[PDB]
């Protein structure tokens, strides 16, 4: 199966710094960008248009770094450089609760299962965990450099015994936290440059981390070991795991590369053409996420476009 | 061909509002199921249109495929309705 051209989505005035989807509505797509706003999209499944935005969310005073959606497809969360987090709904905009207390920018926010609490990795070398009322119940330290990306793991069992989160900063080392005890459990060392993205597999066992040197090296936090390392030979910006089938995608500087990780080869080396842009550096994807069905992959490029790749 | 006039209108109306006719190549079909006139009436009227243009026909698997052309829409305009009307799916 080959990912091909489907359409482009023009709804921003900046780099699409985040893409997120929910299983409640397959036609929804939340997109945070550099223009201090969030654009929710509506998909129709057609030619190059692919559909229209539904709601535009405003209220952040700086670059909205990371956006995420809950399971129901209604509530949304945004991490922006204005030292605050905002909780929205896709119905009428309508920021429910702000989350202030960080002394600097916050990179990544993440919602736990059953909308229970939220974690947030910021640029003040802290991982703040917040309630939905706006109360930061816990603050976690221990990172020497400021964190670049945090994520929760998807528990395969429906809340078996506990939930855990993972952290990745510019300190070439990956932390693994259990916020039930607010304790550190695993230091993951082996990176040679600053880590800028990490992603956990939907199976809840595999962790892929990658940085400026462009290596994508794997961990299994169930066994707390390291499997291997494979490189895209250029800087990589974001990673994404397919929810249904065994693929791993990487948003590189030269373009996008999707990996079939069971026999571990490259697939097609996605290189779209942008009608010129020859003299300077070509635009590249900065944030990407697989859809709920897994047959469509959205990628946020720098030139104001969310591009969709779909298997045939 | 006789082809009475009140049945010519509904054949031409369907060619206006849709522009696509398949019409089941089987004569004396006894009440063709989209336009409730005879299927012999549908086939021969659109054949009468085709011989002067205005529509293109493709035939496969005992089924015709009539499609309205750009030269047929302006003649079907003054024959049936008023201007500023989109016959085919050109309107979005």
């Amino acid at each position: 199966e080959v990912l091909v051209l489907r359409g482009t989505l023009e709804g921003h005035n900046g780099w699409v710094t985040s893409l997120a989807t929910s299983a409640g509505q397959p036609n929804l797509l939340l997109s945070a960008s550099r223009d201090k706003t969030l654009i929710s999209w509506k998909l129709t499944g057609d030619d190059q248009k692919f559909g229209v935005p539904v709601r535009s969310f405003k209220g952040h005073s700086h670059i909205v770094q990371d956006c995420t959606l809950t399971a129901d497809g209604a509530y949304a969360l945004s991490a922006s450089w204005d030292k605050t987090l905002r909780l929205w709904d896709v119905a009428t905009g309508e920021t429910y609760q702000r989350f202030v207390g960080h002394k600097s920018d916050v990179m990544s926010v993440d919602i736990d299962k059953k909308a229970s609490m939220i974690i947030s990795g910021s640029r003040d070398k802290t991982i703040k965990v917040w309630t939905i009322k706006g109360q930061c119940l816990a603050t976690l330290l221990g990172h020497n450099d400021w964190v670049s990306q945090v994520r929760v793991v998807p528990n395969e069992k429906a809340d078996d015994d506990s939930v855990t989160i993972i952290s990745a900063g510019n300190d070439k080392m990956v932390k693994a936290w259990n916020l039930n005890q607010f304790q550190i459990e695993a230091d993951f060392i082996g990176h040679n440059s600053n880590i800028n993205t990490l992603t956990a597999s939907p199976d809840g066992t595999l962790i892929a981390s990658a940085g400026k040197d462009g290596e994508i090296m794997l961990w299994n936090l169930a066994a707390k070991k390291a499997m291997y390392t494979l490189s895209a030979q250029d800087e990589v910006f974001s990673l994404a795991f397919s929810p249904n089938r065994y693929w791993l995608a990487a948003a590189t500087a030269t373009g996008i590369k999707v990996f079939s990780l069971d026999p571990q080869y490259l697939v097609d080396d996605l290189r779209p053409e942008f009608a010129g842009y020859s003299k300077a550096a070509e635009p590249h994807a900065v944030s990407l996420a697989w859809s709920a069905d897994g047959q469509t992959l959205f990628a946020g490029y720098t030139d104001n476009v969310i591009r969709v790749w779909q298997v045939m | 061909m006789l082809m009475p006039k009140e049945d010519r209108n509904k054949i031409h109306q369907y060619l206006f509002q849709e522009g696509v006719v398949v019409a089941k190549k089987d004569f004396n079909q006894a009440k063709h199921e989209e336009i409730d006139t005879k299927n012999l009436y549908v086939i021969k009227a659109l054949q009468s249109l085709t011989s002067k243009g205005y529509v293109k026909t493709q035939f496969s698997w005992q089924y015709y495929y009539y499609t309205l052309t750009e030269e047929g829409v302006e003649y079907l305009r003054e024959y049936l309705n008023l201007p500023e009307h989109i016959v085919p799916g050109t309107y979005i």
Binding site: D47 | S60, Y65, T67, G89, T90
Partner: protein
């Protein structure tokens, strides 16, 4: 519904055969190569494989809506439950359906049989094919029919 699976699985197989013969007859000049039918609930779709997608996709979205409506009217589908896409080809020098249609239209334009065949077979080898073989049969230049073939590489029939 309420059809036995033997008669059901036969039906969509011959539904492909009716659609494939219709698309070869209709989009003959667009380099049509094949289709696949996506059997799914919630507005099942059909994907077309033709070389010239900018001709299959007409002006302001034409030429595929009429095709979708013609399939809708013929096969008795619910409105909005059938849609049509068009991705072009994967390596059109490697498809015989594309190459045989290219052979036919080159012959229809008045090209010589030897000149049209050698140009086609050299393009197939330039497309990375392991072996290619083109055979033309009929009354070529005289009243008595002959058959002259053009091969490059090698071909297995075992």
């Amino acid at each position: 519904a309420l059809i036995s699976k033997k008669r059901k699985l036969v039906a969509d197989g011959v539904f492909y055969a009716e659609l494939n013969e219709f698309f070869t007859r209709e989009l003959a000049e667009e380099g049509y190569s094949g289709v696949e039918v996506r059997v799914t609930p919630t507005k099942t779709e059909v994907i077309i494989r033709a070389t010239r997608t900018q001709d299959v996709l007409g002006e302001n979205g034409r030429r595929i809506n009429e095709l979708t409506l013609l399939v809708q009217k013929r096969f008795k589908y619910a409105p909005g439950t059938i849609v049509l896409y068009a991705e072009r080809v994967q390596d059109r020098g490697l498809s015989a359906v594309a190459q045989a249609e290219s052979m036919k239209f080159k012959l229809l334009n008045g090209l010589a049989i030897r000149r049209a065949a050698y140009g086609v077979v050299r393009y197939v080898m330039e497309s990375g094919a392991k072996g290619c073989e083109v055979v033309v049969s009929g009354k070529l230049r005289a009243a008595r029919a002959k058959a002259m073939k053009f091969a490059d590489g090698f071909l297995i029939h075992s």
